[PDB]
Amino acid sequence: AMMNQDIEKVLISEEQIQEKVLELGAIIAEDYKNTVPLAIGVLKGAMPFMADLLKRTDTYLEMDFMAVSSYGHSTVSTGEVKILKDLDTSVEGRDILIVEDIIDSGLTLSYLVDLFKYRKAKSVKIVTLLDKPTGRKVDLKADYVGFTVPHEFVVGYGLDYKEQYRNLPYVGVLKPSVYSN
Amino acid sequence: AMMNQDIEKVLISEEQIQEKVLELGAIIAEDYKNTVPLAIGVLKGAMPFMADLLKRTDTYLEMDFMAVSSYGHSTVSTGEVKILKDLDTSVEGRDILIVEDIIDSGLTLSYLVDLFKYRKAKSVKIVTLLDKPTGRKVDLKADYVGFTVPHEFVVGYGLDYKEQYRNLPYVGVLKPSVYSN
Amino acid sequence: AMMNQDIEKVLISEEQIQEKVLELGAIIAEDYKNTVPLAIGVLKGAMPFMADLLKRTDTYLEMDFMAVSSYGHSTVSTGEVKILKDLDTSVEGRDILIVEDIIDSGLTLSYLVDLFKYRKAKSVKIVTLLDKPTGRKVDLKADYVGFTVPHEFVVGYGLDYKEQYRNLPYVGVLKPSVYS
Amino acid sequence: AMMNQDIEKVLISEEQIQEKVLELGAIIAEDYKNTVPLAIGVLKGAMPFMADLLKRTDTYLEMDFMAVSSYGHSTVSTGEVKILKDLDTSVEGRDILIVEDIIDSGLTLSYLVDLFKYRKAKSVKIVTLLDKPTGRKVDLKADYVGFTVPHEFVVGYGLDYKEQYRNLPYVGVLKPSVYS
C-alpha cells in the first residue's frame, strides 16, 4: 500500500496474473509433454513472471538465463545486443521456450530467437506476459500471450521505471508526477 | 506428468513458504525504511524465492543478479568462484541484500559477502529461504532465515537435482529411486 | 629445466615468423586501406600473432577480443561455444578481420564467422598464421594464410600444451615424451 | 592518410621498447624460475607489450586475461570495475604477474591487485611498460617498470585514442590538433 501511492492505474491485477499463469502453465505443460524444454528468461524483467509461470507448469523442464546489454544505435535498429551472460548449456537439439515480460518492437527478442535457431535449436517458442503489437518494428508473434496492452509505460511484476517498481505484485501505470522526477 | 510422484516428503509446503515470505518481507521493508537497497540474487537457485520475497517487500528497492561457476577444488575449500555475470551497477556505498536459496557450507556466499565489502558496500545482509547450520565450513550467519533444515538433499522452489525439479511450488525431498538414475 | 629441452625440432623459426607477419601486414594494410576494420582475436592463442601482425599493418584499425568456452559435445560437433566476452561494439556494418593462430578442425571458427554474418557484418575475413587443411571437420578457407603445415603436435607463439609454451618466440614440434 | 601524420613526436622508439622488453624478460625469467606464474593482462592495451615481454621470458608460465568495464563514478574514484571476463582458473596460491601498458592514476589496477590478494594469491606483482608515478591517485608502486615518463598524451604499442593507434610499433605523442 506504500508504493501503490505512485500507481495511477492497476492495469493487470495480481488476481488476473495468477489466473492467466495457471491457464498458460497447463497449456505449456501439455504442449511440451514429449520433451524436456529449456526455459530461459532474459534478466531482469522476466524473472517474476518466469518464477510464477514455471512453478505452475507441471512438467519436467530445465531453467537457464541470459543477460544482455545495448550497443546503442545498432540495438534500436537491428536488435543486436551484447551477450553478458550466455546460456550455461548448449542450444543444439534443445526445445527452447523464451519467457519474456513484454514484446514491443520485438527487435532484441527477434535477434535472440534467430540466434538460438542459428545455434540449431530443435524449436524456439515465446511466452510473454504482455504483448504490445502496436509497437512492432519487426514481424514477431509470440506463441503464448498473457495480456495485450496498448502502450509500454507500465511498471511492476518485473517491469521498472529507472530500476524501481519491479517488486510490485501487479502491472500498473505510474502517476505522471513520477515522470517529472 | 505430476512431479509430486517423485517427492518422498514435502519438507516445506507452499502455504508455509507464502506465510514466511509475508513475515520476512514486512520485516525487511521496515529495516530498510531509510535507504534504497540493492537486492541481489545468485543464479539460478534463488530466483523463485527472490520473486516472492521482493514482491511482498513493500518498499523502494532495486534488483540485480550475479552468475558464478566453480573453479573445482578451490571452490570447495575457499569458496572462490568465477564471475560470469557481475552486477550491473557499482557496489560502493550501497546497502546490499543478498537473497539466497540455502546456506550449507557457506563458503561461496561468504566469498561474495566479503567481496562486496571489499568493493566498499555500506552494508551487506543475507536473507536465505533455508539454513542448514550443521554444514558450516565457515562462520556465517544469515540475518533473515525462512526455515532451518537438517540436510541439503532438497529440491523445488529453485533447488535442483540434475537441473530438474526447480519448478516445484514447494521444497521437497526426492524418493531414493531417482538418485539411482 | 628449459622449454627448448621439450622441443624436438623447430617447425617455423622466429625469423621466419617475422618475415611472414611483415608480408601479411603489408597485404592487409593494402586490402583495408579504404576502411577502418575491426581486428578480432579469440583468446588465448591468437594474442602473440595478433600483436606482431597488427604492428606491421600500417593502417587505421581497431582491435577487440572474444572469450569463449566449450559446451562439450556441441562444441566438438557443431562449433557452438559459450560466449564469456562478447565484442565491446556492434558488428553491424563492420569489416571484420578475425586473427587466428591455427585453423585445424575449423568448427568453432566457422561458428563465429557465420555468427558475425548473422549479426550483419559488412564482411568477415580470416588471417591465420598456420593452416592444417588435414584437420578440417567443416569446409573453411582462410583469406590470408601464413604457413600451410602437415600434422605435427606443435606448440609456441600462442599455441599451448596444458596452458604452457605459449610464450615461445617460435613454433616448435613438441617431444612425444611430453604429451604421451 | 597515414598514422604518422598524426604523431607529433616518437616518445619511445620501437628499438628502445624491444631493448627494454628484452631486459625485462630476463629479470622476470630469473625471478620466477622456481614457480609457474600466472601472467595476466587486462584487455586491451596491454596486449602488444604482453606478447613481446612474455616471448622474451624464457621460463615456464601460463597466460590469462581479464575484461572489465567502467561503472562510472565508482571506477574513477575507487577503481571498482565490472568484471566481464574473470580468470579461467583459481587465484588461490598462484604467483600473479599483471602485465600492464601504463600506470597513471593506478586506481583500477590497485583494485584488481587487492582483489587477487582477497582471492588468496600467493603473490601479486606488476610489470608495466610505462609509469607516470606523478599521476597517482592511490599508493601503487610497480615491481617492474620499463620507462618512467612525464605527463604526455601518448598512443601506440597498445595505447589508443578512441580505439585507434593501438597498432603502432612505437609509443608516440599525438598532435594536439587530433584530439580536439
Coordinates of C-alpha atoms in Angstrom, one line a residue, chain B:
Chain B
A1 CA 3.3 -35.6 -15.6
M2 CA 2.6 -34.6 -12.0
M3 CA 6.0 -34.1 -10.4
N4 CA 4.7 -34.8 -6.9
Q5 CA 5.1 -38.6 -7.6
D6 CA 8.9 -38.3 -7.3
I7 CA 8.7 -36.5 -4.0
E8 CA 9.0 -38.6 -0.8
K9 CA 8.3 -35.7 1.6
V10 CA 7.0 -32.1 1.3
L11 CA 9.6 -30.6 3.6
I12 CA 8.2 -27.0 3.4
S13 CA 4.8 -26.6 1.8
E14 CA 3.8 -23.8 -0.4
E15 CA 1.5 -22.4 2.2
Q16 CA 4.3 -22.3 4.7
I17 CA 6.5 -20.5 2.1
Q18 CA 4.0 -17.8 1.4
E19 CA 3.3 -17.3 5.1
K20 CA 7.0 -16.9 5.9
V21 CA 7.5 -14.7 2.8
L22 CA 4.9 -12.2 4.1
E23 CA 6.6 -12.2 7.5
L24 CA 10.1 -11.6 6.1
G25 CA 9.0 -9.1 3.5
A26 CA 7.5 -6.9 6.1
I27 CA 10.5 -7.2 8.5
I28 CA 12.8 -6.3 5.6
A29 CA 10.6 -3.3 4.4
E30 CA 10.9 -1.9 8.0
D31 CA 14.6 -2.5 8.4
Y32 CA 15.4 -0.8 5.0
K33 CA 13.0 2.1 5.7
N34 CA 15.6 4.8 5.2
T35 CA 17.5 3.5 2.2
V36 CA 17.0 2.1 -1.3
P37 CA 18.7 -1.3 -1.1
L38 CA 20.1 -3.3 -3.9
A39 CA 18.6 -6.8 -3.7
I40 CA 20.9 -9.4 -5.3
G41 CA 20.2 -13.0 -6.3
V42 CA 22.8 -15.6 -7.4
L43 CA 21.5 -17.6 -10.3
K44 CA 19.8 -20.0 -10.7
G45 CA 18.5 -21.3 -7.4
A46 CA 17.4 -18.1 -5.7
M47 CA 15.1 -16.9 -8.5
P48 CA 11.7 -18.2 -7.2
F49 CA 12.3 -17.1 -3.6
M50 CA 13.6 -13.7 -4.7
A51 CA 10.5 -13.2 -6.8
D52 CA 8.1 -14.0 -4.0
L53 CA 10.0 -12.2 -1.2
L54 CA 10.6 -8.9 -3.1
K55 CA 7.0 -8.5 -4.3
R56 CA 5.9 -8.9 -0.6
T57 CA 8.5 -6.3 0.4
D58 CA 6.6 -3.0 0.4
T59 CA 9.4 -0.6 -0.1
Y60 CA 11.5 1.1 -2.8
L61 CA 14.4 -1.2 -3.9
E62 CA 16.5 -2.1 -6.9
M63 CA 17.2 -5.6 -8.2
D64 CA 20.3 -7.2 -9.7
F65 CA 21.7 -10.6 -10.3
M66 CA 25.1 -12.4 -10.5
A67 CA 26.2 -15.6 -12.2
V68 CA 29.1 -17.7 -10.9
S69 CA 30.8 -21.0 -11.7
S70 CA 33.0 -23.4 -9.8
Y71 CA 36.8 -23.4 -10.2
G72 CA 36.8 -27.1 -9.0
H73 CA 38.8 -28.0 -5.9
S74 CA 39.5 -24.3 -5.0
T75 CA 35.8 -23.5 -4.7
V76 CA 35.2 -26.4 -2.3
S77 CA 37.9 -25.1 0.0
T78 CA 37.8 -21.3 -0.1
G79 CA 34.5 -20.6 -1.8
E80 CA 36.3 -18.6 -4.6
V81 CA 34.2 -18.7 -7.7
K82 CA 34.4 -17.5 -11.3
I83 CA 32.3 -14.4 -12.0
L84 CA 30.3 -15.0 -15.2
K85 CA 27.9 -12.0 -14.7
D86 CA 28.9 -9.1 -12.5
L87 CA 26.4 -6.6 -11.0
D88 CA 25.0 -4.1 -13.5
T89 CA 25.8 -1.2 -11.1
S90 CA 28.6 -0.4 -8.6
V91 CA 28.5 -1.6 -5.0
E92 CA 30.3 1.3 -3.4
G93 CA 28.1 3.0 -0.8
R94 CA 25.1 0.7 -1.4
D95 CA 23.1 -1.3 1.1
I96 CA 23.4 -4.8 -0.3
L97 CA 20.8 -7.5 0.4
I98 CA 21.7 -11.0 -0.8
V99 CA 18.7 -13.3 -1.5
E100 CA 19.8 -16.9 -1.1
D101 CA 18.0 -20.3 -1.5
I102 CA 20.1 -22.3 1.0
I103 CA 23.2 -21.9 3.1
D104 CA 25.1 -25.1 3.8
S105 CA 28.9 -24.8 3.9
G106 CA 28.6 -21.0 3.4
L107 CA 31.9 -20.8 1.6
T108 CA 30.8 -19.3 -1.7
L109 CA 28.3 -17.0 -0.1
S110 CA 30.9 -15.8 2.4
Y111 CA 33.3 -15.2 -0.5
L112 CA 30.7 -13.0 -2.2
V113 CA 29.8 -11.2 1.1
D114 CA 33.4 -10.2 1.8
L115 CA 33.8 -9.4 -1.9
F116 CA 31.0 -6.8 -1.7
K117 CA 32.7 -5.5 1.5
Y118 CA 35.9 -5.2 -0.4
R119 CA 34.0 -3.2 -3.0
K120 CA 33.0 -0.9 -0.2
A121 CA 29.4 -1.7 0.3
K122 CA 27.7 0.4 3.0
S123 CA 26.3 -2.8 4.4
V124 CA 25.8 -6.4 3.4
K125 CA 23.0 -8.6 4.8
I126 CA 21.6 -12.1 3.8
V127 CA 18.1 -13.4 3.7
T128 CA 18.0 -17.2 2.9
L129 CA 15.0 -19.4 2.5
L130 CA 16.7 -22.4 4.0
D131 CA 19.5 -22.7 6.5
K132 CA 21.5 -25.9 7.2
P133 CA 23.8 -24.7 10.0
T134 CA 25.2 -28.2 10.6
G135 CA 27.1 -28.0 7.3
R136 CA 29.0 -24.8 8.0
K137 CA 32.7 -24.9 6.9
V138 CA 32.9 -21.2 7.7
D139 CA 31.5 -18.8 10.3
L140 CA 28.5 -17.2 8.6
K141 CA 25.0 -16.4 10.0
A142 CA 22.2 -15.2 7.8
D143 CA 20.4 -12.1 9.0
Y144 CA 17.0 -13.4 7.9
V145 CA 16.1 -17.1 7.7
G146 CA 13.0 -18.7 6.4
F147 CA 13.4 -22.3 7.7
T148 CA 16.1 -24.5 9.3
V149 CA 16.6 -27.9 7.6
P150 CA 18.7 -30.9 8.6
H151 CA 20.3 -31.8 5.3
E152 CA 20.8 -30.4 1.8
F153 CA 19.1 -33.2 -0.2
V154 CA 16.2 -30.9 -1.1
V155 CA 14.6 -29.9 -4.4
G156 CA 11.9 -27.5 -5.6
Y157 CA 11.3 -23.7 -5.4
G158 CA 14.6 -23.1 -7.2
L159 CA 16.6 -26.0 -5.9
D160 CA 17.5 -28.7 -8.4
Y161 CA 18.6 -32.3 -8.8
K162 CA 20.5 -32.6 -12.1
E163 CA 18.9 -29.4 -13.3
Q164 CA 15.3 -30.7 -12.8
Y165 CA 12.6 -30.0 -10.2
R166 CA 13.4 -26.3 -9.8
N167 CA 9.8 -25.6 -10.9
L168 CA 8.1 -27.1 -7.9
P169 CA 6.0 -24.6 -5.8
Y170 CA 7.3 -26.2 -2.6
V171 CA 10.5 -27.6 -1.1
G172 CA 10.6 -31.4 -1.1
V173 CA 12.8 -34.5 -0.7
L174 CA 13.1 -36.9 -3.6
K175 CA 12.4 -40.6 -3.5
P176 CA 15.7 -42.6 -3.3
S177 CA 14.8 -44.3 -6.6
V178 CA 15.6 -41.1 -8.5
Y179 CA 19.1 -41.0 -7.2
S180 CA 19.6 -44.3 -8.9
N181 CA 19.2 -42.8 -12.4

